[model samples]
Target chain A: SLINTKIKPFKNQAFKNGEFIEVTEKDTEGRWSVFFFYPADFTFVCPTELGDVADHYEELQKLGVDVYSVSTDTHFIHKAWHSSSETIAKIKYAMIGDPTGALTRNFDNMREDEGLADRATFVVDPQGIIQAIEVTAEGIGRDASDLLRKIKAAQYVAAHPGEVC
Target chain B: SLINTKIKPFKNQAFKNGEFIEVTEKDTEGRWSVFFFYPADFTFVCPTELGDVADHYEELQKLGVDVYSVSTDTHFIHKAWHSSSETIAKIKYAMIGDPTGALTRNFDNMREDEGLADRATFVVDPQGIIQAIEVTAEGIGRDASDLLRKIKAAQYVAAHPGEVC
Candidate 1:
């Protein structure tokens, strides 16, 4: 009824609440969480995809989940983009910058040639077990509603173990 | 004095002319040429960017430039993508596949973390000396017109060397 792997550990700097913060594997444990990755920050964000998730931020928070958008840009750029770009401002989640691309590799989502992460999303359960993942080509866009549906299923599976039935 | 550096030699397979063919650094000699590098093929091409270049391809050819778009996918994938994607079908130039990433590393454009090429463009003269280079983050879209402008400048500079009055 389970898998062998949990998510990898990562320690990196992030931007949120108008302040720079340190983030690590400990933050996502004991809660439902989402790790979102895109190609780059400031200039090349998949805006519509990030916007879709931002539009659903409240529902995600209400569902006891945290979202972290990862990019190879610096935390300074993340902070700047959050305020400078209307598309990124709607995000209330933490913006994690992996300047050295260390975190991007942890997800195996880095587009090795570009030194940027590919478009990828991962959902994790309360115990930090990865529950769902979605990766797409740059030309294709993803729907947040699909993510929501997957979360519903993940939550459902978490609530009902394979004991009685 | 002009820059002494020249593009490194590379031998790779490419898809073009509705067939698979071999391409090498020698093929670009005695011609105005462009090396167009993008993240990947099939799924994640920067369509608008590729589209822009494809749109202006004829003019580039008339100007004596050969454009070679390079990625890490195989020539087979490039051929399939050329026929499968309407956007890709517009390209009449070579679609070079650098699966081993050796050609990509020669340009110093490969992103070490992901084994994929970055969004980079380079213009080389008939002598195979690079004249203009442009590199951008993944999210920011590039305009073909800007690339054309750079090529023109490079050509102008190539013709009038030593800044003679």
Candidate 2:
């Protein structure tokens, strides 16, 4: 629960990003990871954030980080969303569908009423521990560039150790 | 994992809400309950959502429902927020603290990095079964009215049964 500390949770749930695969801690191989979550698929405000994340995907990859966007929606829905939604389609990272909600529930971001995960983001270090976590309510949207900056900050801390403040 | 399924994550730990004792779950006398979570005590976007929920507390109460808002902050911090922040000051329900992050983690909304919770909301029926759930990332604000609407819809379904599709 400490800041910049390692966070290891249960993993191995299938998600979609134009393809289907189970996302795991091993996904963060030789690099950092960004796990972004939203409430649902095909909703307002979510696309904006996803688009922003997509815009920074390459930059994050250049930083040797893997990005994954997750929701309660299934992988089939993610493919459908990518095929139709232009902004989401441009996304290159995995778009996960947590129907079982194992990941969502494990992360504790799932909303108990709406049957969906909350809009939350996690910056995981190379060691697979959570570095930074942020959860927001509905109506408000996240800024991807801001998240990228945060990821960068996290990375700095991960690498240099206390160099970032 | 199913809705309205009582997962007794927090039963013993007690927190103070305006001198009243606050715990995670309790036996309700045939009434609906809600758990609303925000990031911190006095941050941007969170206050707005809390204020919105507070504005509609009376109406929700009229519908035979009780509301509980939570965060990772300490109950003392909740008291301070209630006193200093105008928005949080108006909250009528129990604004509990998840300082231990146990409730948040048990609920699976904990962001591994910051040891904070994802913006999550839970609606529980009188049976203590989770009827509905919603989680939003950090930055997205939630509306109390929408929450009420969902609760009403859930109640209608529970009462009418089979009419829901």
- Candidate closest to the true structure, highest TM-score: 2
| Candidate 1 lDDT over residue span A1-165, tens digit each | 011147888899999868999999999889989888888775543478888999999999999989999999988989998887888888888999898988887766676777988777777787777665555444334568767866776776577643221
Interface RMSD of 1: 18.8
Model 1 chain A — which ten-residue stretch has the worst lDDT? A133-142
In candidate 1, stretches whose alpha carbon ends up further than 4 angstroms from where it belongs are A1-165, B1-4, B44-46
lDDT of 1 at B120: 71
TM-score of chain A of 2: 0.87
Model 2: share of true interface contacts reproduced: 0.00
For chain B alone, what TM-score does every candidate structure achieve against the true structure?
0.93, 0.88
Every candidate's DockQ is: 0.02, 0.04
